[PDB]
Design a protein around this nucleic acid. Structure first.
Ligand SMILES: O[C@H](c1cc(C(F)(F)F)nc2c(C(F)(F)F)cccc12)[C@@H]1CCCCN1
Ligand SMILES: [Mg+2]
Ligand SMILES: [Mg+2]
Ligand SMILES: [Mg+2]
Ligand SMILES: [Mg+2]
Ligand SMILES: [Mg+2]
Ligand SMILES: [Mg+2]
Ligand SMILES: [Mg+2]
Ligand SMILES: [Mg+2]
Ligand SMILES: [Mg+2]
Ligand SMILES: [Mg+2]
Ligand SMILES: [Mg+2]
Ligand SMILES: [Mg+2]
Ligand SMILES: [Mg+2]
Ligand SMILES: [Mg+2]
Ligand SMILES: [Mg+2]
Ligand SMILES: [Mg+2]
Ligand SMILES: [Mg+2]
Ligand SMILES: [Mg+2]
Ligand SMILES: [Mg+2]
Ligand SMILES: [Mg+2]
Ligand SMILES: [Mg+2]
Ligand SMILES: [Zn+2]
Ligand SMILES: [Zn+2]
Lengths: 96, 100, 25, 102, 127, 91, 81, 201
RNA sequence: CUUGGAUUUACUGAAGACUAACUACUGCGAAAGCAUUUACCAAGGACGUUUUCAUUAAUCAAGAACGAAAGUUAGGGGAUCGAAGAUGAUCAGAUACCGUCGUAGUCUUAACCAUAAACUAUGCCGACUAGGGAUCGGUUGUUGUUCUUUUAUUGACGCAAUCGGCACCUUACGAGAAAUCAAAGUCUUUGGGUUCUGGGGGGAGUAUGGUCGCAAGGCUGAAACUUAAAGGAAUUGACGGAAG
């Protein structure tokens, strides 16, 4: 179900893919949600979640690796983390 | 020639049916072909239901039954006379025999 | 003879034929 | 410690005696299976790679898992040179002349 | 006021076990088999041998003090036959007729969910 | 083009050692020269070092594995048994 | 039966026939005008509707699709056209 | 030879207060000697006694309770609840043809951290005015009944201690509540909690 | 195998398989096949439709996918059964039936093999010809019935229709050598479309050649020669270590 919600958000809404974009969006306060893949290094995870704690942003832990997060986003590359900037037709922020 | 329109089994609209072992000889027989009898017998014969009821510490105690479902192959059943060879015209009758 | 055992016999005779020709290649 | 591992635990580098720092199941692909415990006598029964059952102190230690590098014997050496290089860093036991040929 | 044991009677088609334990079943009080009372294998499972064995079991149990038993009849079970042997009924009637008191009777034949292959082969045992 | 019909990597051995031994070498030597998925970074950069040693070129993680494959069946079973026991009834 | 009027079948047996097996096939569905309790606005809805149609006035679902005829929600009254 | 029964000492088994006839019966063990105590070999014993005996009433004749002894006070054995099961004959008399059988099981923890597996069983009931030969429920209905079963055992076990659950079991509260809760799904008969198992103590 | 405590009994644990009863003239799948729960992944028939496209279709040499069991190669597992083998009986002999063990195998992972009485011994598509009751899925109309909950928009059940299935019962207009068949009918009153196969029995699924396969083997496949029958269904009798 979350795959369908994520596909709808990627298709209609706004997002950034990648650690540097996610951290920039957390610094600027433009992030509504940060999704982190399961096989992300723990040091990077605990740093993303310290940024999210400071920014008051929810964190969703994807159960698959960055290969499955990449194919969920409809991408042909790997996505270690991503931030949802604007949930459009989806309700992921209201469901997570 | 063809002896039975059902081929002696009960497989129609089906490819394969998992087998069962004959109770008497342990022969692998398809589940639909096996001769199956459901028996619910008293565990104590009526001769001994009296002395066992008097020896019972419970007044008005019902003796439990023994429930069993027996599976026979065609050879097991014919040998034990569970089923018998019937005439050509009498083979078609599918009502249960009227004995019980 | 039984057809199945006759078939096994013929298989054994083909085996012998094959080995005999293989002897001289 | 062996007593801290439930029955059926696959364990490796197990101590025969408390403190010898590992004796059993040390070669590639090998391990020791913990069969059961006898808490009254403080003993544990294990099954060794040879198939033997042994009784060890429950205070003896072991490492959880299978020794790495397994499946090595599955490939043929294919060559005398391969056996030569195998024993060049083990010891002088190869090649072997048959005693009947002496 | 009575003291209950558990009379675990195992009646197969080759022998008959009359095994009297306590209520818990960890303590055996008397175990006389039908093969201990006759010298022919063909009649180790006879009703006569099972009844005599049960009567001797009752006599030995009484002098130890067990005054009542619950009955747990069983057949061989497993992949083999599920019907109790001919001697279990005679050993039960003999126990009832020997002055010992009988409580509940239950069948505890081991019945597998499905199974684990049965001996005899695909074509069964011929003869 | 396709260069060999069936020998594959064992074509370096020529006609020697016997066909059964060469196909036995081929089975395990394709496994020891294959590239495996890194369980840590997700890239296909894992190669064997010495026997039992599997290195990832990308993230420089070394993992202990099998002689010719990254994971043996016994190790896979222990990994799954431990993950069950924990992430389940025993929390 | 050798003699039978095939061109003028009895309308009782004609109505029991399957919809494709009549002399001229004709749908058995129809359109209804559904009045929700909240307001009064004619809204044409197909009887075997596959969509959860909502009226313009109040955002209330008029019918829910089923295997056959759509099931109207409570407080909604229908009249066959 | 020695007659090892001269060295047997009889002990009394005491049931929890949930039952009525707390005089379960008598057991025996080798008399406590210097080398071997009677206590260590007598504790840990499991007694299987029918609930009809534990309650006097014959309405419980088809359920039998396992009591596990874990403390000894002189000649009395203080037992605790160890499990529930149906008799084989009762289950075989309930499993007829021309009807649907539905089963469910769940691993559940009590209020006091007693790990149980509870097995529920039920059968479709043939209506009094029913004419067709068979009474079969669709597999979707069986899945919905199974889910309602699962969430009812989960609720009625996680909200109570083991003694209270036993007090719920004796009048068959859970089976009647499952039957009541599944009325709008399919008619059922002989709805029972047929087995409860202790895994870890 | 057993006074070295067997068998039996209770508790505990570990291994692999396997899913009893429910289970049926019942379901699904192209077939082989598929039966513990739940989750996830992608499929499917039927039904309903006053949605959409408009001949896109039917059968198919060549060429492909899948294909029970057994079998082959290598790991894993290897509880139970168990080819081979070993053993105790029976017998004139039994290296057979019966008993006790038992290796491959049985299970699984990567690949092979492509055969079965793989059967409904009945190719696939289409039209028509005769009555009946059951049953599974869907849909549409309706109860002196039980039930949600106390009632409805609960569900179950009951009565009718219908489409699709798995089948069944009676008759024989009709077919057939008959057994029998609602198709094996609409075939000398011979023509709806199309694929495959057979031409007396053996020799023979043999030889040879080709091709696939690691192998076992698979597919394709003669001739010389030989022979008056072989065979199908039914009738009367005779016989049976079959029943009455
Ligand atoms: O006692 C068994 C058991 C087996 C095995 C294994 F298969 F790996 F050898 N490992 C077990 C372990 C272990 F730690 F993974 F080794 C702990 C407890 C029980 C184990 C069962 C089966 C697995 C789930 C419950 N324990
Ligand atoms: Mg015949
Ligand atoms: Mg079908
Ligand atoms: Mg078949
Ligand atoms: Mg040297
Ligand atoms: Mg050598
Ligand atoms: Mg010399
Ligand atoms: Mg015979
Ligand atoms: Mg089952
Ligand atoms: Mg079904
Ligand atoms: Mg072709
Ligand atoms: Mg193997
Ligand atoms: Mg084996
Ligand atoms: Mg065996
Ligand atoms: Mg011999
Ligand atoms: Mg034998
Ligand atoms: Mg063929
Ligand atoms: Mg058939
Ligand atoms: Mg054919
Ligand atoms: Mg219907
Ligand atoms: Mg010819
Ligand atoms: Mg003939
Ligand atoms: Zn047979
Ligand atoms: Zn890596």
């Amino acid at each position: 179900n979350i795959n369908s919600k994520l596909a709808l958000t990627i298709k209609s809404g706004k997002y950034t893919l990648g650690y540097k974009s996610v951290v920039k969006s957390l610094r600027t306060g433009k992030a509504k949600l940060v999704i982190i893949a399961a096989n992300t290094p723990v040091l990077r995870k605990s740093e993303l979640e310290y940024y999210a704690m400071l920014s008051k942003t929810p964190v969703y832990y994807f159960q698959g690796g960055n290969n499955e997060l990449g194919t969920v986003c409809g991408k042909l590359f790997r996505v270690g983390t991503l931030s949802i900037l604007d949930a459009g037709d989806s309700d992921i922020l209201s469901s997570i | 020639p063809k002896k039975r329109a059902s081929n002696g089994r009960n497989k129609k609209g089906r490819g394969h049916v998992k087998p069962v072992r004959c109770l008497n000889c342990a022969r692998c027989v398809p589940k639909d072909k096996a001769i199956k009898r459901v028996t619910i017998r008293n565990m104590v014969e009526a001769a001994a239901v009296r002395d066992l009821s008097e020896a019972s510490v419970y007044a008005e105690y019902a003796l439990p039954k023994l429930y069993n479902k027996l599976h026979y192959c065609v050879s097991c059943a014919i040998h034990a006379r569970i089923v018998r060879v019937r005439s050509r015209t009498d083979r078609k009758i599918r009502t249960p025999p009227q004995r019980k | 003879m039984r057809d199945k055992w006759r078939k096994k016999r013929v298989r054994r005779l083909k085996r012998k034929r094959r080995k005999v020709r293989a002897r001289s290649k | 410690p062996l007593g801290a591992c439930p029955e059926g635990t696959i364990v490796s580098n197990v101590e025969e005696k408390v403190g010898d720092r590992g004796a059993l199941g040390r070669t590639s692909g090998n391990y020791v299976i913990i069969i059961g415990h006898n808490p009254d006598e403080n003993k544990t029964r294990v099954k060794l790679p040879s198939g033997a059952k042994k009784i060890i102190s429950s205070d003896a230690r072991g490492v959880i898992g299978v020794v790495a590098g397994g499946g090595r014997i599955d490939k043929p050496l294919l060559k005398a040179g391969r056996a030569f290089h195998k024993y060049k860093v083990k010891r002088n036991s190869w090649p072997k002349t048959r005693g009947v040929a002496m | 006021s009575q003291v209950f044991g558990v009379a675990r009677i195992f009646a197969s088609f080759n022998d008959t076990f009359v095994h009297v334990t306590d209520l818990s079943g960890k303590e055996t009080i008397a175990r006389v088999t039908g093969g201990m009372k006759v010298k022919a294998d063909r009649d180790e499972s006879s009703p006569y041998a099972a009844m005599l064995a049960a009567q001797d079991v009752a006599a030995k149990c009484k002098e130890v003090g067990i005054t009542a038993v619950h009955i747990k009849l069983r057949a061989t079970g497993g992949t083999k036959t599920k019907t109790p042997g001919p001697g279990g009924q005679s050993a039960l009637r003999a126990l009832a007729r020997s002055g010992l008191r009988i409580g509940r009777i239950e069948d505890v034949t081991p019945v597998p969910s499905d199974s684990t292959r049965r001996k005899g082969g695909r074509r069964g045992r011929r003869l | 083009t396709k260069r060999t019909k069936k020998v594959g990597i064992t074509g370096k051995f020529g006609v020697r050692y016997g066909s059964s031994l060469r196909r036995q070498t081929k089975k395990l030597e394709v496994q020891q020269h294959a590239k495996y998925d890194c369980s840590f970074c997700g890239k296909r950069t894992v190669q064997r070092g010495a026997t039992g040693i599997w290195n990832c070129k990308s993230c420089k993680k070394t993992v202990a594995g099998g002689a010719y494959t990254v994971s043996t069946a016994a190790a896979a079973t222990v990994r799954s048994t431990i993950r069950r026991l924990r992430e389940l009834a025993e929390a | 039966v050798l003699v039978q009027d095939l061109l003028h079948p009895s309308p009782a047996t004609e109505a029991k026939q399957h919809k494709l097996k009549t002399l001229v096939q004709q749908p058995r569905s129809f359109f209804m005008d559904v009045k929700c309790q909240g307001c009064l606005n004619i809204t044409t809805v197909f009887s075997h509707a596959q969509t959860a149609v909502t009226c313009d006035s109040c955002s209330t679902v008029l019918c829910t699709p089923t295997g056959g005829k759509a099931k109207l929600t409570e407080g909604c009254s229908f009249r066959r056209k | 030879v020695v007659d090892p029964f001269t060295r047997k000492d009889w002990f009394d088994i005491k049931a929890p207060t949930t039952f009525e006839n707390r005089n379960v019966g008598k057991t025996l063990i080798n008399r406590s000697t210097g080398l071997k105590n009677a206590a260590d070999g007598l504790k840990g014993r499991v007694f299987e006694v029918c609930l009809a005996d534990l309650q006097g009433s014959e309405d419980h004749s088809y359920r039998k309770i396992k009591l596990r002894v874990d403390e000894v006070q002189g000649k009395n054995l203080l037992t605790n609840f160890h499990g529930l099961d149906f008799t084989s004959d009762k289950l075989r008399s309930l499993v007829r043809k021309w009807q649907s059988l539905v089963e469910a099981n769940v691993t559940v923890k009590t209020s006091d951290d007693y790990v149980l597996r509870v097995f529920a069983i039920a059968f479709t009931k043939r209506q009094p005015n029913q004419i067709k030969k068979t009474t079969y429920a669709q597999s979707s209905k069986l899945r919905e009944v199974r889910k309602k079963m699962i969430e009812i055992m989960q609720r009625e076990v996680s909200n109570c201690t083991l003694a209270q659950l036993t007090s719920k079991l004796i009048p068959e509260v859970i089976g009647r509540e499952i039957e009541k809760s599944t009325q709008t799904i399919f008619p059922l008969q002989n709805v029972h909690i047929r087995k409860v198992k202790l895994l870890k103590q």
